[PDB]
Symmetry: C3
Subunit: 137 residues, 3 copies
């Protein structure tokens, strides 16, 4: 059986940011030479997630507003006992889920007509990685 | 290694609907002849998800009410700049997560005593697909 | 191809509880002899989930408070028609997502610097299982 691993590193210019990584993942799928298989794309951190959204602008704005609404920055989270006040970023990671698993069909990332893979940074400005793990034939 | 792919197509009679697809997935697991492996079941759209719930009626009603409560239809989402006002469906997809991964054990879908796989449509009435991707031996 | 299955059983002392199972999963990864692969860790129940959080105390308290806030116990959920009033536990399962999929790299669980796998019980005090399903080489 074939297996392929690749790590993507980000250091966003902002604390919160949406980064397209579909082509990155597609590059990995090609390198893996896998014809049929599974492709896991997961954030290795608790304050960021790999999500599948689409490209529309307005929707990107809606998700930040919904995230802030459901998992708002707060000064009083208990996590702040450590002096860290990125508690909301952890909640946003829980909310959105840290990862996605995609099919590989006929040597291709099996995506829907509008699906796009993003690295959703919730506490960036420092080096953080995303793992791509592919298995199959 | 063995790999099997199958797409399920839905065109719900309603914008929002709960559709049982466990037997569909089980049919695919049988066709794949896989003894031991993994089975990914994922929506190929941003406005629908594959979820695992159970069969109880009341709970089905609770999830729609909770979804509407956490990701309410709204006329003012920015996504509406496109004239599309299914923004809430995208949020519901984020909320519930687009997919599930299930074990295949001894040639069988490895499910809990009450687990049932559903295709949860949040903006239906048009052709949308779900991918089943199986790998293993 | 190699495949390995192991079930973890819990019967929490409390209705709601956070249980570390990272070492349990690591034990399974070792037993599987898999060098490169995927490792699914999923709750077999609708009222509990496998989540990835980190170890900080304050954050553990924040997640219970956020969960209760987003998916509060309630006496009036429709699910209660059955006399069961664990409706909130089902919602919490939806919220947090029942499972996680982890990479196996060089015979090791491929985890981030702070990632820890937990069994998050939302209606415990009875025997419930978590499945570990590993495939790869």
């Amino acid at each position: 059986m074939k297996a392929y691993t690749k790590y993507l590193t980000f250091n966003t210019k902002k604390r919160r940011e949406l980064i397209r990584i579909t082509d990155e993942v597609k590059k990995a799928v090609e390198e893996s030479e896998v014809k049929e298989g599974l492709c896991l794309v997961s954030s290795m951190h608790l304050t960021s997630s790999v999500i599948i959204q689409d490209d529309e602008e307005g929707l990107h704005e809606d998700i930040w507003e919904w995230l802030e609404k459901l998992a708002p920055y707060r000064p009083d989270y208990k996590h702040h006992r450590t002096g860290e006040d990125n508690g909301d970023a952890h909640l946003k990671n829980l909310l959105t889920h840290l990862q996605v698993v995609l099919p590989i069909t006929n040597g291709k990332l099996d995506l829907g007509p509008w699906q796009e893979i993003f690295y959703a940074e919730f506490d960036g400005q420092r080096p953080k990685r995303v793992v791509i793990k592919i298995i199959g034939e």
